[PDB]
Amino acid sequence: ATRIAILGAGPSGMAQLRAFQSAQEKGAEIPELVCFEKQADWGGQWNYTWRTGLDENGEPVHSSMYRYLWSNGPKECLEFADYTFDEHFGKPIASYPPREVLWDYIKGRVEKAGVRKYIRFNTAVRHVEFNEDSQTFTVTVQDHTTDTIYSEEFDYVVCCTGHFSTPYVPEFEGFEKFGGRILHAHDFRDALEFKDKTVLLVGSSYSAEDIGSQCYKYGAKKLISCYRTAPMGYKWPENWDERPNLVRVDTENAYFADGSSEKVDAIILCTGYIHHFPFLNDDLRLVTNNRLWPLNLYKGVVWEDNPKFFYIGMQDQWYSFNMFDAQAWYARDVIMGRLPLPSKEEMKADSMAWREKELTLVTAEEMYTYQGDYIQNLIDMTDYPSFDIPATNKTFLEWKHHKKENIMTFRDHSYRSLMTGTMAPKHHTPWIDALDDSLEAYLSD
């Protein structure tokens, strides 16, 4: 009788299916589930592809992940509370696993849940309309396996389409004339492409940090990072420097705000992403910048203009997978009727409260502690196994510290699991010398 459409089979869409399956396992009647995915497989960002721009169906390439990518936070900060690393890998592993390993892990859970059967792959979501007459959603999709466009009626929609895929790509003067590659971090795939090259990186967040680190590791001659407002702050290697922003570009040269000048071979724009939902009209569409707390989302999940429509993972992330889990579990309970929603007036007030609080945050520590607090709120309302949130916050602190000490070796460190207490062993190869990013290599000796 009740039908839910879940948009995307990324970590969040997986979490949503996991949430319902978990309720069903406990004897509960769950609604009919349909999950639309445009890729051929699950994993979202984590499913790797050599492709760039548009995929073989003409849909924008989703994954922004690149070769040699490893986890950027401690894995212990993203461990599933109901599916441990210990359960999955059958043994202790190091704290910063390669993409393939974390992909194997998140798949591992949904494999055990039997939820693949709900996903229509190779299917891109085209449009979502709310019908006021029947109080249902018409979800229109393109099945690229059959080359068919069809639609179905749903009672609730859960958007898990992510927000690190549609690039924010600013222009700089001279770009039409520059003789080198100008790509966005989203199209970055292989560091080897930039070996012995001089690479300009425009940005001062994780993509700048890590893509630079990848180019360094795989042998770029020189790296130049430029910042908009403030530098990354770390002590970079001898051939890597940070400067004020790019101002213009020659056929061969880049010109910066400090009056500085350099000959660059390639420009990689690590300038972030936008919240882009081409399948939604303004009545349903979330419009926001990347932040810990976007507005119009009750408990960070419920669309305030239409509370039958939900968003997962739309916040900026310190916490990732177990946030999505907490979000999806909450969305489940609302959908199912276990948690009734307040007035539209009372929802907005709760959101503004969280917003006002977000505005006071200065330090990294305050910020992921704020997110930790948000998740604590969510899990308390739910079956989801409460886990050690304060102890996670101390793991993040140790990680921040490890980065400040040496940015090129923070991945060499190890952390205690906050689910099992399993002390993660030191990896068989220091990050810098571990050229192989395969799962097989990582789990071997």
Ligand X SMILES: NC(=O)c1ccc[n+]([C@@H]2O[C@H](COP(=O)([O-])OP(=O)(O)OC[C@H]3O[C@@H](n4cnc5c(N)ncnc54)[C@H](OP(=O)(O)O)[C@@H]3O)[C@@H](O)[C@H]2O)c1
Contacting positions for ligand X (CB under 6 A): 69, 71-72, 164, 170, 185, 202-207, 210, 228-229, 245, 270-272, 290, 317
Does 318 carry a binding-site annotation? no
Q: Which residues contact 273 (CB under 8 A, 6 or more apart)?
A: 64, 163, 164, 165, 166, 167, 168, 186, 290
| Spatial separation of the C-alpha atoms in residues 341 and 351, rounded to whole Å | 13
| Spatial separation of the C-alpha atoms in residues 216 and 206, rounded to whole Å | 15
For residue 359, the 8-state DSSP code is T
| Spatial separation of the C-alpha atoms in residues 112 and 107, rounded to whole Å | 9
Min dist. Cβ of residue 215 to a copy of itself (A): 14
Does 151 carry a binding-site annotation? no
Binds a copy of itself by CB under 8 A, chosen from 108, 120, 197, 274: 274
CB 14 within 8 Å of CB 313 = no
Residue 148 — φ and ψ, nearest 5°?
A: -125, 150
CB 10 within 8 Å of CB 160 = yes
Nearest to 410, CA basis, from 220, 271, 206, 238: 206
CB 264 within 8 Å of CB 282 = no
Chain-centre distance for alpha carbon 26: 30
Which of the listed partners (ligand FAD, ligand X, a copy of itself, none) does 22 bind, with a CB threshold of 5 to 8 Å by partner kind? none
Q: What residues does 255 pair with on adjacent strands?
A: 248, 261
Nearest to 18, CA basis, from 312, 318, 332: 332
Residue 17 — φ and ψ, nearest 5°?
A: -65, -40
| Spatial separation of the C-alpha atoms in residues 208 and 172, rounded to whole Å | 17
Binds a copy of itself by CB under 8 A, chosen from 32, 153, 173, 190: 190
Binds a copy of itself by CB under 8 A, chosen from 26, 27, 29, 50: 50
Instruction: Please tell me whether residue 223 adopts helix, strand or coil conformation.
Output: strand
Which of the listed partners (ligand FAD, ligand X, a copy of itself, none) does 256 bind, with a CB threshold of 5 to 8 Å by partner kind? none
Helix (H) or strand (E) holding 333: helix 321-336
Min dist. Cβ of residue 47 to ligand FAD (A): 7
- Quick one: which segment of 58-66, 209-217, 253-261, 298-306 binds a copy of itself (CB under 8 A)? 58-66
**Binding region for ligand FAD (CB under 6 A):** 7-13, 36-39, 44-46, 62, 64-65, 71-73, 78, 124-125, 160-162, 164-165, 279, 312-313, 317, 320
Does 62 carry a binding-site annotation? yes
Nearer to a copy of itself, 103 or 321 (CB): 103
Does 317 carry a binding-site annotation? yes
Q: Which residues contact 345 (CB under 8 A, 6 or more apart)?
A: none
**Contact string 114-153 vs a copy of itself (x = CB under 8 A):** ----------x-xx------------x-x----xxx----
Does 241 carry a binding-site annotation? no
CB 73 within 8 Å of CB 97 = no
Does 3 carry a binding-site annotation? no
Nearer to ligand X, 144 or 275 (CB): 275
Helix axes 364-380, 389-405, angle to 10 degrees: 160
Min dist. Cβ of residue 183 to ligand X (A): 13
Nearer to ligand X, 118 or 178 (CB): 178
Residue entry with tokens 């609604």: 31
Does 343 carry a binding-site annotation? no
Which of the listed partners (ligand X, a copy of itself, ligand FAD, none) does 434 bind, with a CB threshold of 5 to 8 Å by partner kind? none
Which of the listed partners (ligand X, a copy of itself, ligand FAD, none) does 162 bind, with a CB threshold of 5 to 8 Å by partner kind? ligand FAD
Nearer to a copy of itself, 58 or 425 (CB): 58
- SS3 string of 154-174? ECEEEECCCCCCEECCCCCEC
Nearest to 298, CA basis, from 347, 371, 343: 347
Which of the listed partners (ligand FAD, a copy of itself, ligand X, none) does 271 bind, with a CB threshold of 5 to 8 Å by partner kind? ligand X
Min dist. Cβ of residue 345 to a copy of itself (A): 25
Nearer to ligand X, 71 or 123 (CB): 71
For residue 280, the 8-state DSSP code is B
Does 316 carry a binding-site annotation? yes
Does 205 carry a binding-site annotation? yes
Binding site for a copy of itself (CB under 8 A): 48-56, 58, 60-61, 124, 126-127, 140, 142, 147-149, 166-171, 175-176, 178-184, 186-187, 190, 192-193, 274, 276, 278, 280-282, 285, 287
Question: Which residues are annotated binding-site positions for FAD?
Answer: 12, 37, 39, 45-46, 62, 72, 125, 320
Question: Which residues are annotated binding-site positions for NADP(+)?
Answer: 70, 72, 204-207, 228-229, 245, 290, 316-317, 368, 411
Question: Which residues are annotated binding-site positions?
Answer: 12, 37, 39, 45-46, 62, 70, 72, 125, 204-207, 228-229, 245, 290, 316-317, 320, 368, 411
